[PDB]
Every structure is written in C-alpha cells, then in structure tokens.
Design a protein around this motif. Sequence first.
Motif, PDB file in Angstrom:
ATOM      1  N   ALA A   1       0.822  -1.201   0.000  1.00 36.89           N
ATOM      2  CA  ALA A   1       0.000   0.000   0.000  1.00 36.89           C
ATOM      3  C   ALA A   1       0.858   1.254   0.000  1.00 36.89           C
ATOM      4  N   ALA A   2       1.948   1.244   0.755  1.00 34.10           N
ATOM      5  CA  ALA A   2       2.876   2.361   0.769  1.00 34.10           C
ATOM      6  C   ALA A   2       3.784   2.383  -0.453  1.00 34.10           C
ATOM      7  N   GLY A   3       3.578   1.479  -1.416  1.00 34.10           N
ATOM      8  CA  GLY A   3       4.320   1.477  -2.659  1.00 34.10           C
ATOM      9  C   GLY A   3       5.642   0.740  -2.628  1.00 34.10           C
ATOM     10  N   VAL A   4       5.979   0.091  -1.516  1.00 41.11           N
ATOM     11  CA  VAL A   4       7.168  -0.747  -1.435  1.00 41.11           C
ATOM     12  C   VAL A   4       6.873  -2.069  -2.133  1.00 41.11           C
ATOM     13  N   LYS A   5       7.749  -2.467  -3.054  1.00 39.29           N
ATOM     14  CA  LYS A   5       7.547  -3.687  -3.836  1.00 39.29           C
ATOM     15  C   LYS A   5       8.654  -4.721  -3.651  1.00 39.29           C
TER      16      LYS A   5
END
Lengths: 288, 289, 292, 287
Positions: D44-48
């Motif tokens: 959700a925080a964009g960490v992949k």
Amino acid sequence: CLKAVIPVAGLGTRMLPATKAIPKEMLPVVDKPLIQYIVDECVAAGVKEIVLVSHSSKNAIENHFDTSFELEAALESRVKRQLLKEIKNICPADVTIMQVRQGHAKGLGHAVLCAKSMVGDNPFIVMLPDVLLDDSTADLSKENLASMIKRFEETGHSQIMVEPVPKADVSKYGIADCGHVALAPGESTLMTAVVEKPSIAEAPSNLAVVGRYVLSKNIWPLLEKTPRGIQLTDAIAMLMQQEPVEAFHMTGKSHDCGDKLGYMKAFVTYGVRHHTEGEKFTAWLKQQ
Amino acid sequence: CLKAVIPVAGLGTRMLPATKAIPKEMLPVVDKPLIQYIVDECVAAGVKEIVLVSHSSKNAIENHFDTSFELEAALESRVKRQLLKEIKNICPADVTIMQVRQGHAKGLGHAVLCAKSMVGDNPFIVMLPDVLLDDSTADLSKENLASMIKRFEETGHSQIMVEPVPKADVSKYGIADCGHVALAPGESTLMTAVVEKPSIAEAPSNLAVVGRYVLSKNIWPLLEKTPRGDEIQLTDAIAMLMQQEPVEAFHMTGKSHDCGDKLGYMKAFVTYGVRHHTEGEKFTAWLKQ
Amino acid sequence: CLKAVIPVAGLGTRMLPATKAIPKEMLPVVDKPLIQYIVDECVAAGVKEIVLVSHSSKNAIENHFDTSFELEAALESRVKRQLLKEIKNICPADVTIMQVRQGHAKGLGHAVLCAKSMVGDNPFIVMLPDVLLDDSTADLSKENLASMIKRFEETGHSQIMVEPVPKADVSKYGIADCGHVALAPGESTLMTAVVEKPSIAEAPSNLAVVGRYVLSKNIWPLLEKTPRGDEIQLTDAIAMLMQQEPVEAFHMTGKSHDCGDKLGYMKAFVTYGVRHHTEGEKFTAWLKQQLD
Amino acid sequence: CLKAVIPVAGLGTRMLPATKAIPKEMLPVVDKPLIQYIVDECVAAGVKEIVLVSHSSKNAIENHFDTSFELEAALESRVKRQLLKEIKNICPADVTIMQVRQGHAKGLGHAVLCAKSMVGDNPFIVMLPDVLLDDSTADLSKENLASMIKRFEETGHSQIMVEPVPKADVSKYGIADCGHVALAPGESTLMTAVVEKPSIAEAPSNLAVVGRYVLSKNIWPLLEKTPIQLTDAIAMLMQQEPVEAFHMTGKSHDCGDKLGYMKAFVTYGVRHHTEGEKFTAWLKQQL
C-alpha cells in the motif's frame, strides 16, 4: 508378525558435511538413499510394518516413501510414465511405515524403548540403517534377515547377525564369543558375550556384530532396567544370562555406510552393476 | 561488485529416486553437496553475495550454509572440536547467501529475472549448479570465473564460458559461433551466436556452453521482454544482447563435471574420491585391488 | 487399552488463507493449537497412545509435541525457567504419539484404514481434531470420551457421539436416527443410520454427529470393504457395522466448538479467551469497555 | 526505490505455546497471518521489494507467499475457483520477497545488518512484524509509512514512528524525546533522544516508538560498529544527523503481546468481510 524397528535419529557426524542438512539415511548409493535399500531388505524378508525412531530434522526420510505430489504432477505432464510408475511404487502398497520421535539422543537402547508402544510385549527386529546387505551377493528373501526370522520363530532363540572379519581387524567391531565353533555362512550357534573392540589376542572369534537383530520379547523388561551407562548391548548381555542368544552367520557381503570410506566403496560397487549406467561406468573405471 | 545468481529450483528428475525428497543440489560428491562446491568456486573468485532462485522443497540448501544449532551443540557436547570448527566455516564470514522463490518452473531466463530485485541495474554472474569446475585442474582464484570477471571489468563485454567437446557430440550442447577463430584456454573472443543443439556439420565450432556467465547490465530489459520459447530462455535474451553490443566466449581451463546426469555424477564421485583429503589414499588402493 | 486415531491430513480449505502454510490443527485458540486441546482430551480419558494420520506438510504438529531443541536452549539462555518447564510438559512422559502418512486424500475411512497396522485387530478411538470439547463445561476425565469408553467397555457396542441442535439447524450436520427414542445427556441408545444434511421433514432426530467414536474391532473388515464415490467414507462402514452388532449414539455433555468453521473458530477464541488463566481478566474488562 | 527490511527471526517466547512449532509471524488474526498484513501494508505504501531476515524454522513464512502447489491443485480439482483466485493473490504480482538468514540471535540491529547486501548504500525501511497498523483507521496508501516516506524524500531526515500512550504506561516502551514540541497526528518533529522504558516522572513524552522506520543510508557504517541494538545505532545517528519522530495516525495492534494479539483478533473479527456481522451480534451477548 514381527515389526522392524529402525533407529534413524542420529545426526550423522561421521559423514559431515554431507549430512549437515540432509539425513545420513538419505545419502545416495548411486541413485538410491541408504534407507530405500533397508526398506527393500525388510520387504524381501516379509516384514510389512516398519517403525522409524526419528528426529525433527528427518522429514525427508518419510517424504521419500510418501506421495511426492508435485513430483508426480511434473512426471505426468512430461509423460515420464515408467519413471512415474517407479516413483509411485518405492513403497509397496501393503507396507506401513510408522514414525515416533526419539525426543533425546539417549542411545540405541532408548531408541528401541521409544518403539515399545507399537511393538507391544512381543519380539521384534532391529536394523541399523547405515549397514546395507548387498542383494547381488545373497537372496534377501531367503537368506540373512529372512533366515534369522525363520530360526527365531522355530527355536525362540534371539538371533544376532555376525560376519567374519580378518583376524587383524577384530579391534574395530563388537566381537561375538561363540566358544570357538566353526560357524559357516547361514548357520546359527549359541553366543555367550559380545566383546567391544578387543585386541587381536583378547578376541573370542573373528565374528563381528553386523547390525541385524531378531529379539525375543523378554528383552523388554531388561531394557527398562538398563542403566544410563542406555545401551542395547547391555540389555542383550542381560538377556544371555537368562536365555540363549544365537549368533547368525551372514551370507554374502555387507557395506558399512556409516563410515565415509565404506560409503564410497558401496557407491562404486553398486555403480559398476547399475541397471542403466553400469556398463559405461565400468568401462570408464578401467580406462582410468 | 558482482552478485552470483544460482538457479536451484529444478526438481532433479534425471537423478531419481535419490532426489525424490532431497534437493539435487545436495547430492554428495564424496562428502560435500554439489552446492558447496559451487559456493567455494564463488568465494575463490572473490564473489561475496550469492542469490539462490529456489523452491519450497529446497530448505536444506539454505540450512547447509546457515547455523545448524542442534548439530553444533552436539559437536560441542561430544567435544568434536575440529569438526565443529569445520562446519562453522562452511560459509565464510564475509559471504551472504540470499534466497528468492521462483514460484513456477518457467525457464532459466525466468529464474534469472527473479533475481533482478537483488542485482539491480547492474551486471551479474550466473552459475548453473549441476556443473562443477574441478579445482584440481585449475586455480579458481585466477582462472575461469575469476578470469571471466577480470575480462568483463576490462571491456564491458559479457563473458560466456565454453569448452571444447568431440566434434561428434556437438549436438548435445549449446555451441558458440566465434567466426572460426582460434581460441586458447583462458582466452576470450567475439561470439556472434549460440546455436541450440546444432547438427554435426552445421556446428560453427566445437565450443560448448559450460554454464558460467558474466552478464552485462544491459541484458535486464532484454530478458524482461523475452517471449516464451514453453520457457523463457536465457539463450534468447543473450541473442538479443548480441544485436546491440559484443558478447565474448571464454575458454574454460581444466575440466568440468556435469553432475546433472547420473553417469557424470558417478564419475565425479570417484574422481573427487581418489584425491579425497582423508580417504583418497585408501580409496585409491581399494580401487586398484 | 484403546489407542486414539486422529486424522490430520486435510488441507483445511475452510480456514484459508491462515492454513495455506500452517496446519489447521495448529491454529491457536488464544495461545494453544487445536491439536494440543485434542491430546489433552485424550490424556483426560486415560489414552496413552495417539496415532496421527498425516501429510508431508504437517511436520509442525509432531514438532509441537516433540523436543524443540533450539527453543529450550533459548529459554534457558534468557532465564525463562517457568516457560521452559511449561513447554517440556506439553506431552506427558507416559504418552506416545506416532504418525503414519495417509498418502492420498481418500476420505476419513481411508485415514482410519491407514492406522490399521498400529491398532491391530482391536477396538480403538477416532477423534476429529477440528472439534474441541470444552473442559469448562464438562469433566473430560469422567464425561464424553471417558464415558463413551466405560460404556463400550461394558456393552461392547460402538459409541458415536452426538449433540442436539435446534430444529432450525439440523440441515447443516449429519443427523443420527435413534428411532423415536429420545436421548438424555450422558446416555447411549441404539442407532440405525446417519443422514447427511437432511431436510426438516426427513430428519430422524435433532442429534448431530460430533466427531468422537469408540469403535469395535469388527469395523475393520467392513472398513476394508467400503466403496468409494473417490473417497472411502467412515460413515458407510459404520452403516455396515450396524447389522452385525448394535451401534449406540452417545449424547455429549457440556459444549463443543466446531473450529473447522471460521466463525466457530472465532467464537472459540473469544470463549476460551474470556477465561484464559492469565489474560482473561483484562481481556474480559476490555471486551466490556467496548460493547457498553 | 526503498526496500522494506522485516526482521522475522525471533522465536516468539511471549506467544508460547502457540509459537512452539509455528512462526509468531504466522499467528492468524482471524484468518490471515500477521505477516500478510505487514506485506499488505508495504504494498500500500508502494514498497515492492521486501527483505525477510529469518531463521531455519520459519519456512512457513515464505511458503505463505510462494506457490502452494498441492493446495492449488486441490482447489482446481474441487472447482473452488474463487478460493483459488484469492490464494493466488496473496503476494501481488510485482512484489518480490527475498530472504536471508540471521544465523545468530544477535539482536534487531544485527538483523538489519544482514540485509545490507540487498539494500546497498541506500536508505531503507524497517518494519517490526508483530505490530499491525489498522487499515480501517487509516488509508495506508496515503498515511503513516506512506507519508513517512514522502517526508524522508523531501528532507533526508530519518523517520521514527511514534504514538501517544497513556502517560501511566510509558515504562513499557521506547519513548521519543521531542524537545518540548507538541506533536500532532501525521506530523514530524526533531527527536532530542530516545529513552528505553523510563519512569512515569522521567519520561520526556508520552510518544512511544511504534516499530516503523525510514532510515538514512548513513546508519549503515554506524550499524557496523555498535557495542547489538538498532536503537543504539539510531542513537549514534542522532549524534551526527537529525532524526524525526512521526506521529502515527489511526490505531495500531501490538501482537507481540498475548493480550494485544487477542484484542486484534476480536477487533478484526467484528469487521470481517463475511463473518463480521454474525460474530459481532454473538459477541454482544457473551458477557
């Protein structure tokens, strides 16, 4: 019906580092783990119930004889149909492998004690899984463990497998004291003691304890009253003082794969006769 | 600083039933699993970071290089002090072993792609783990992968290890086209194609791909758009790389062991066995007699 | 002396995704896995030998009752002596847990077959591990499985545990047919069939099969001859049993928790939680601060 | 791009005996393991890219996010295809989970050190996996770790997440000293010290360290030379660089604690997407 108790909880420090993360029972002799030979020998001798006394690290032993789901699926969608058939049949459909955890490394006698609940107040078989009986040198459906079972069930005398070793070697093994009888292959004679690694002049025979046992039910109370000094050897010594125990002379040859060099020898010996690679392996070995 | 990517997800069907419930990477050559030799080869070449592209059934590979808590305790308790020191040292203190799951057996190219997050926009090494480079035939601190790294640093040209094979066996292999120039051991030369299993008389050389690669960072976007071939093949991505920059073949020194195949594994067992550091003398005399 | 056969091979698809990579038998009711409650029920009834019919993915079940070597060493090193003593006593020293692999997901009757060689030609116990019998509502030393045993020991009629459900609910369960006879708690009566998820108008009672059995040895050849559908059901084999000899339904006392069902699991968590021996006071007070 | 370092090597002694043979990270909050909420919070925080620092006993964590082969086949053959689609979606298709073994329980700072090879000479995120941020109380794509990241990008200041605790509870926690500044939710401010479990009177604030961090690359050489505690090297970072407290919005769940785990279970239970109403109604009557 006799069950086979197989202690498989040892960490295999003599085969390090190969055994750091895989069981010693899973070391391949060419293309098969040690334990498959042991289970095949059981099956050949008519045993249908096998009790593994095992360890949290040894899941791979049971997986070997269980369904390997993803492996079969891959074999199917590559039409390796003969390979799929063999994989499915590593464990015969009438053979039940059961497992109990030893809990603590407390020796071979403690291991046997862990199996009491499956065996009951009954006789039983003990097979040390690091030693293979070479079925190219003996019919394992008629000789060795099969014959020990027959002799035990006809006579009531516990049977301990022995094999002659060269007189210079008696110091490596437990040596049976058979009172200097000329014991021939496949025969049984009364044994009064096992001597743990005698000198060449302290040795009561050239008969070395192999690691196959058919044990009368009367060993159970002895095993329970056995000190922590816990050794199956000691309860066996206690059994001799109340009833006769016989040494059984192994036929053919055996391979001690508990020892790096013995395992390497077994690898080459099985390799030269391998059903698919034996001829090429043999020829290459000779050109070396 | 190059990371070594090692695909270790395959289920090892050529080595069945031995590999039914243990990884092919853990088959012992005498007393050491295949993967330990691979990692030693890395260490010899100065690689310090190793990326395993693995599979849910392959925990034993990571367990072999990690601390084995109860084994160490047992060795301590039984005062097997030399053994305990040996297993503690299986993985050097400055070497880090990383693991990502492949998820599906989609090809060597896909396996390599799984490592991109750990490699980044950077060049990297690929080692296929069933092939051993025999360090009794070559000094792996200076030859082979070590030399491939040095050459790549000098030129930016990807290096693909090759080795000469009898001209009649070339169809079993990937075979390098180097413009029919002479290639000496330890040397690199321009390679314009890899031909997958050429016919005898169609083969552009006798130089077979061994399974060692130093690959340029520019292969990443090419790999990412490499179509299914039904696997994403690393060889197809390398073909794309040759269309936009030079790739070189490197001539292996010494001998290799293809342990992905039963016979080759059995030969390696004996060959390492005769020179084994404690058993070699006895094993050799036993073979002779 | 009867052994307990416990089928633990199922993948527990009703509790996904929690059970994707851990066994459903290891789902914790507060701080204890389901299977630990099951074994304690065994121990309460005097069972000493427990047979797990299992699957390659379920090593954690056996690890839970075995020595956890590195965890004991860590509890020592961090001077957590009470905790160390507690996890060492999860399985009483006089209890043996043995395991067999089922091999193929071929139903509960096949799982029970897989244990044949360990039971022998003897009576035995079956316990479905997703159902807990709540020991705050009955004394499991004297009731339920323990009472089923003492009955079988006297009658030799097999005992199948049932519990009454509301009329509104009989269609969810397998319903026992005791033929018009009304059954009291703690009592056993003759039974002739079980109907899987009946209509209201075809319900032969309100007595739902719980998942506890004391079974006579004469079920063994019947089990070996039960047909498929491709699963071998234990029910079809108990059917055949209800002809050679009488089979009795046992009325469970107290309350059970069906933890194979997500909501049932959630309810068990709260119910055990409010009386948890160390957290129940604060958990109860926190629950009533909400709500009110 | 920031990678998230998640230390998952601990043996979970506080949740015994549940964790005897399963990871604390796999404890189910209703029907999902703790770790799945953490990964959802990352994505959700964009960490992949997620780095697990792990232990030999913790295979189940990686199996949860990998392909479960036999389970998928069982669902296919039983045509439970909705369920099959859902378990195929546990790990987003662009999320990479990597793993490295800690080797010796040398503490949380050592565990972060294990991830250096993967992170590089770069800033990075730390997430303590026993603590959940409740996504019914905050949009985790715009608040909390997400906003912590945006603040770090603009400033280069490391972000330590904090939340107000009852002033009487301050001895259980690491407490942020924000130098007499009155922090508001969603905002950052300089931290003059971090005190470990202070007395009620000595406590410099009621702002407790949550277990979410965005750390500057400069902690790396500091981490390597540390007497092995993450907060000591955090302390040394502040001896040369400004570090900020970030005020969490919403609520969090400390599931490292038995009671915290039970409260999370119930709280997520009452809002469960298929069992929430039945459970809520039944819970009302249970006291």
